[PDB]
Amino acid sequence: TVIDEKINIPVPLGTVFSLLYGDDTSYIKKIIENQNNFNVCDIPKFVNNAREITYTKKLNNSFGPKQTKCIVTETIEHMDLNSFFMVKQIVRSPDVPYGSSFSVHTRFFYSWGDHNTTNMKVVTNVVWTGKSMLKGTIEKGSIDGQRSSTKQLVDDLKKI
């Protein structure tokens, strides 16, 4: 469930918001392009605190499909204008075994830190809409790669 409990971003809350979710989508597009993905759509601005992002993810697993599409729903859930905000991703990947029976939900918690730093926690969980003996492989499939995805995102986020 709890991917990363406390990373610290040496940049203010409002700028981390702008850098990952601002109306200039070029940073997040570079971020997303760096996580083993291709055929990335043109990254939309948020409208009504929601935006859709599509791409194909290359997989190196035991023997999944070894690539799958991803239809990602990204929404800004909570905005306390000074102390914290939170973004929630719902990620569908129809091409994998038992796709359309689940989605991956990841919450990105960003909070005002000391001398106006930003610390983030990342929490995910699979929501199920169908039975599947694969349940516990997908569940730890989601957690495992999300762990990797967060590592690249904070790795690229600090560089700038």
Ligand SMILES: CC(C)[C@@H](C)/C=C/[C@@H](C)[C@H]1CC[C@H]2C3=CC=C4C[C@@H](O)CC[C@]4(C)[C@H]3CC[C@]12C
């Ligand atoms: C045996 C097979 C069927 C197993 C391994 C399939 C695992 C899939 C479902 C996993 C592996 C990589 C995972 C994956 C990696 C990284 C991210 C980035 C994150 O920001 C949203 C979720 C997302 C997109 C997830 C979704 C679920 C994926 C695509």
